[PDB]
Amino acid sequence: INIQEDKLVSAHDAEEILRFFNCHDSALQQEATTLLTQEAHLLDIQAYRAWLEHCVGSEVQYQVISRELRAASERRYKLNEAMNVYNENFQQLKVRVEHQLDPQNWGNSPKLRFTRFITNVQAAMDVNDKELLHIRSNVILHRARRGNQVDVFYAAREDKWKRGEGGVRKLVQRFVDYPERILQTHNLMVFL
């Protein structure tokens, strides 16, 4: 992609495209699909400890940003472009997991219901780090609670996965640029 011609495309997005258009490996796309489907299943049944043990690498950065709305032609205003809804290392994820599992987390009674839909899976090995797997996927996440509360989240996820303990591929980075600026879902207290 030539971003001088394709005026609406960011340098970052153009870089991410190139990663997948190159070496296509069907087997890798299948492995990636299994990995993400199993991760989503663990999350949906709220097996948060199992998710940490089986899906999340010790060196993880788990990040979801909210980007301030700026003019397309803006070039002078240089202040912090985004805030971090999530920007978690492993211990910080563990804190959030303990918070979910605490019997005095009143908001979790009656039990929440989660349903995740993972689509558009793409996978490519890193050029420089032969053990680093880039995975892109989109998620629709449905959360239902308390009879008539229903919140639906939509996002694209840019992941890096790497083999850890026991040769198991685990998440070492997730990056989400959340597409809705003002959340209409009460909060973003879900693991995208």
Partner: protein, 446 residues
């Protein structure tokens, strides 16, 4: 409903009718008597530091453009074109010398003036009086140590006087620390609560912390963590509560400089705050230096709240009686190391942001308490705020305002709602003043 006569808040602020959290007619009345009358938070110097820098902000349900002028001042204007009423600016922040309407192309300056009209000579000739067509300007814009507030009512007290007795408590952190910066952009989330529900919670509710936030206290290891599940009541002398004439109030939890921050930031923060405190002892005295590094949960009336030291900064933007748009910024001390500022900002969002796990604990509390105010059998019911009543003082030799010398109570609810009722039943500032001439006596009865 006759707002001149209806007792929505009982004497001494001891109770409020539950309908205040659900009644849409009252919400519409609040737009006039609360939001169009009082000081509302706009932005910070640190977000619009250079000429031409601007942000958009809500003031009540209205949207304004807040712009740094060439002369260093700040002016704010309705984000509404003077021609056919289109929204002028569709972004949240930027830098520009003016704003052009996308409908018919009218061009307004950063100073609000109508500067250009397409084909003016051929179309309007000399007949368009552009001098009278400037953007509708917010009458009053003032700063409290970089924090910029606006007010539509030219008759309002100056912002400093409006803060009343609360200013004394804010000054050690806002002024004597060397100054604060606001870290943007804010998180933004809609909750199904009345704006008063989180406003009252931040102004004066320490009682809820151990129970509501039991899981966050247990999981995060913060310094207030002994409170988890009401396992331990803070010792006597652990803190105090205050309130003021114009409704602002706060709780003070002594020494709690690391606030809600998880154990990962506790040692660094407690060292930094303690070190600055030692310097401030010599400048502002021991008590005020201690207040600097003490956790303040404050509401600046009506709908701006904060937790100092934790660094949480909130705007509860009203949408309707059961809908509020929550803006969350981080406050940091300017002289903190940049890496600490960065980690503090992330931690503010981690705990109280859109995915703030502490803030999530409050959701059902705020939302259901608000929504129940619409329910038929609850509209005329009385919400209670009598804890600590009859033990408050005024004019104390050390701590100013109406003060409850205990960490947990409802002193600040009473002052918030006393001011609220005085505004709702008044047609202007003069009437509020008349309704408030015995404000502290009313709060300290029995």
């Amino acid at each position: 409903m006759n707002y001149n006569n209806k007792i929505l808040v009982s004497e001494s602020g001891l109770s409020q009718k539950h309908l205040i959290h659900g009644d849409e007619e009252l919400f519409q009345h609040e737009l006039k008597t609360i939001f169009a009358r009082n000081w509302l938070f706009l932005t910070h110097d640190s977000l619009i530091p250079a000429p031409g820098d601007y942000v958009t902000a809500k003031m009540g349900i209205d949207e304004v453009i807040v712009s740094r002028q060439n002369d260093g001042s700040i002016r704010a204007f309705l984000n509404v074109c003077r021609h056919r009423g289109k929204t002028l600016v569709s972004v949240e922040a930027g830098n520009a010398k003016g704003f052009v309407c996308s409908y018919h192309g009218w061009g307004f300056g950063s100073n609000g003036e109508l500067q250009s009209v397409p084909f003016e000579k051929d179309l309007y000739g000399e007949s368009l009086n552009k001098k009278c067509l400037g953007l509708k300007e917010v009458a009053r814009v003032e700063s409290f140590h970089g924090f910029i507030y606006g007010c539509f009512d030219q008759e309002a007290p100056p912002l400093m006087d409006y803060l009343g007795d609360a200013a004394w408590y804010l000054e050690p952190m806002f002024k004597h620390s060397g100054g604060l910066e606001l870290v943007g952009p804010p998180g933004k989330v809609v909750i199904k609560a009345n704006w008063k529900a989180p406003a009252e919670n931040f102004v004066g509710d320490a009682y809820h912390v151990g129970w509501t936030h039991a899981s966050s206290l247990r999981s995060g290891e913060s310094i207030f963590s002994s409170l988890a599940g009401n396992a331990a009541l803070p010792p006597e002398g652990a803190g105090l509560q205050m309130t003021s004439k114009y409704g602002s109030g706060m709780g003070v939890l002594w020494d709690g400089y690391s606030g809600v921050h998880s154990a990962d930031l506790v040692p660094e923060l407690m060292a930094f705050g303690g070190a600055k405190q030692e310097r401030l002892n010599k400048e502002i005295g021991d008590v005020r230096a201690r207040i600097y590094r003490s956790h303040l949960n404050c509401t600046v009336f009506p709908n701006n709240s904060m937790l100092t030291c934790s660094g949480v900064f909130k705007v509860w933007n009203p949408i309707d009686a059961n809908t509020t748009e929550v803006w969350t910024y981080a406050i940091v001390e300017k002289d903190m190391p940049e890496d600490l500022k960065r980690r503090l900002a992330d931690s503010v969002q981690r705990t109280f942001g859109p995915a703030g796990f502490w803030e999530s604990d409050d959701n059902d509390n705020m939302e259901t308490a608000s929504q129940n105010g619409k329910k038929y059998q609850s509209r005329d019911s009385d919400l209670l705020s009598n804890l600590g009543f009859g033990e408050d003082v005024y004019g104390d030799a050390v701590y100013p305002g109406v003060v409850g010398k205990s960490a947990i109570g409802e002193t600040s609810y009473r002052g918030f709602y006393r001011a609220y009722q005085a505004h709702v039943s008044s047609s202007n500032w003069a009437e509020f003043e008349h309704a408030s001439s015995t404000w502290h006596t009313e709060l300290t009865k029995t």
